[PDB]
Every structure is written in C-alpha cells, then in structure tokens.
Amino acid sequence: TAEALELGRQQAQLLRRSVRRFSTDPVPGDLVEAAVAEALTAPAPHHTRPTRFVWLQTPAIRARLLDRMKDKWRSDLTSDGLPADAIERRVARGQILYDAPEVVIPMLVPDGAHSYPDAARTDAEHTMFTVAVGAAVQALLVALAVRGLGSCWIGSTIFAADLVRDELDLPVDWEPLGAIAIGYADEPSGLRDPVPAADLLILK
Amino acid sequence: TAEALELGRQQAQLLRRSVRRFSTDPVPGDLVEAAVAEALTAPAPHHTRPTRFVWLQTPAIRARLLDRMKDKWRSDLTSDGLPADAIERRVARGQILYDAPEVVIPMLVPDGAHSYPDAARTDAEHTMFTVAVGAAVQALLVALAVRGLGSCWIGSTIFAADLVRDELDLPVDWEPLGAIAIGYADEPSGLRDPVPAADLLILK
C-alpha cells in the first residue's frame, strides 16, 4: 500500500501523453475545472498572475477561430512557395483542434508585471512570464491525466495571436500560448518509462 | 493498492512548493538525474528538443556567476535611482541561489527549430520553444517533489543572459530561463489544497 502510493506519485507525470486521437465520450466539465485549479499551483514570480486559461465552450466560436487560423496558415505556406499537396498535409495536423471534446487556450497576461523603461528588462520580464505560463501548461496536462483525461498541447495560436484576440474580444496584452485539446484517449497507452537525460543534462 | 496507486497519482503535483529554506542534508545525485529524466517527458513541438538543464555542480563556478549577476543587478537598480537600502533588499532575494544545496539552470536551445525568413514566425517559434521549457521546469519541480526533494524556480538568469553565457562558455543561442534551487525543505509542509480557479479561468 505504501509502495503502491509512492509508485502512483512517480507515475503521475508518466501518465501524460500528447494524445492525437480522442474518443467521442463527453468530458465532465467539473474535471476540467478541478484540473485547471491544480494547474495554477505551478509557480509564478512573486505577486504575479501570469496565466489565464480560456475555455472555448461555445462550439461556433471555436470553429470560427480555427477556420480563420486555417486561412492564415494556408496563405503563409502559400507565400513560402509550398505546393498545395504539402500544404494540406501540414494544415491537417490542426484538425485535432476541431475534433477534440474540449479546447483550452493558455494565455499570458501582464498581471503583476514590473514597468521598466528599457527594452532589455521589459523583454526579460516578458520571457519570465512566458516560462511561468508554460509551467502552468504542464501542470494542466498532468492534472488532466491524473483524472484519466488525455490532452495535447500544440503551439498553434502562437502563430495567429491577432486572430485569437480579435475573435475572442480580448485585450491587446493577452498573449495566446497555444491550444490544449482535451478528451478520453481513443486508444489507451501504457506509461512513459523515461530514458536517462544523457546529453540533455549538462554538468558544469 | 489500486486506490493507493490512484491516490499517489493525484498527490504528485500537490507536493510541490516553492521552497525558500533548505536543510544542509546533501542531495543524492541519483535523484536529481532521475528527476531531470522525468522532467524531459514534458511536451515539446514535434521533432524538437527545446530544453537543456545545466547543473552547476562546481561551487566556485556557481559562486562566480552569481557574483557577476549581483554586480549587474546593483548596477541596474542604481541607474534607476533606487536608494542603497532598497537595492540591497531586492538583491538579498537572490541569496537562496548561493545557499541552495543544488542549482540547475534551465535553458532554451533551438534544437529542431524551423528557419523562417520573417520575424513574425521566427518570434513565434521562439515563444513556442520558451513555453516548452517552462513546461519542462514544472515537470522537474514535480519530479523532484515526488522524490522527497524541495525546489524553487527563480527568474534570475533571464535578466543576465550574456553573463550566464559568458561565464559558462555557452554559445550565443543558449538562453537561460531562470534557476532552480534544490534541496530537502528545512521545514516539512503538507499537501496543497488548491483553491478554485475563479477569475483565472475564462469561459468563452
């Protein structure tokens, strides 16, 4: 029992997978709320609240936002001189945001930011706030897993920040930091068994 | 044991505190390495490795980097016209990094980054990499927690990137994303009990 509970603690993050395919089972709303409450236990700089989670419950609003992001995405890749074949293969990786039972957009906001007159420290503060939001993202993906819910974070909305703010009527200083698809995994997976860090850990 | 396993999973992230005071009990290296390995299960964009962890095992190296950082800190705050006592109160907040049993610098590196001709997508890709490292930061803090080890992430090095690169002999595109002090907490603390998300969760 003691061994099992310690094991469980060391399985929590290993339950976390970047799930591509979801079942059509509905997701109980209270699990998302409770998961988000747990995500916001991630650390943040003193007296700041860098993270906001924006839950796209209205299906028509999600679809309109994604459709516009898709149009930007095709037009960008079309400027790059990509052939139409390779464009649909690229944009089709975003279909998961259309199909997921629920989508949540993590956002940065400057709540508690210091005001510096110089660009260097202004940028540094912004980067610090961004790291904090990413922490909250992992905490969400884990808090969902631990409630049996699959999820996938994708950069997505970072490349369409204006579209996101416009479509959601959000102020200029809310910065989207991707999109989190949520649902019951269509096909369950076994746990992660992490490999050693090897060259990803540098000793000085 | 089925319930104990379920409970252990649920407890994981709730063991994590931003710990400010550690005991002098030495940190087993094994646990840091395994925690770092778990940390790297955090999500990353496809075919990238955005994160490196730089473990400052050499005391004189740690000490010299921090001294250089402090000097820059006092110098910035002095330009701002802060009075000396106020400079010193701010600078004292960094003492935790001197005293911590172990310190690990999380870093961004553009391993697998896409090369775009335009600033917009270049900055987006960089943002996306930054969020991922943040996610790996949370994951390390939690992986350390489930192994009985406290930690604290501090924005610190983000405000002195050139010095960190110079002091550690790292190439220009390694970007420090704070610092993580690690140790056995000086005073135990119970599990967190997160409050509801409230105004940090926006419904759309």
Swiss-Prot record, chains A, B:
<feature type="binding site">
    <location>
        <position position="192"/>
    </location>
    <ligand>
        <name>FMN</name>
    </ligand>
</feature>
<comment type="function">
    <text>Bifunctional enzyme that catalyzes the GTP-dependent successive addition of multiple gamma-linked L-glutamates to the L-lactyl phosphodiester of 7,8-didemethyl-8-hydroxy-5-deazariboflavin (F420-0) to form polyglutamated F420 derivatives, and the FMNH2-dependent reduction of dehydro-F420-0 to form F420-0.</text>
</comment>
<feature type="binding site">
    <location>
        <position position="44"/>
    </location>
    <ligand>
        <name>FMN</name>
    </ligand>
</feature>
<feature type="binding site">
    <location>
        <position position="155"/>
    </location>
    <ligand>
        <name>FMN</name>
    </ligand>
</feature>
<feature type="binding site">
    <location>
        <begin position="16"/>
        <end position="20"/>
    </location>
    <ligand>
        <name>FMN</name>
    </ligand>
</feature>
<feature type="binding site">
    <location>
        <position position="76"/>
    </location>
    <ligand>
        <name>coenzyme F420-(gamma-Glu)n</name>
    </ligand>
</feature>
<protein>
    <recommendedName>
        <fullName>Bifunctional F420 biosynthesis protein FbiB</fullName>
    </recommendedName>
</protein>
<comment type="similarity">
    <text>In the N-terminal section; belongs to the CofE family.</text>
</comment>
<feature type="region of interest" description="Dehydro-coenzyme F420-0 reductase">
    <location>
        <begin position="1"/>
        <end position="204"/>
    </location>
</feature>
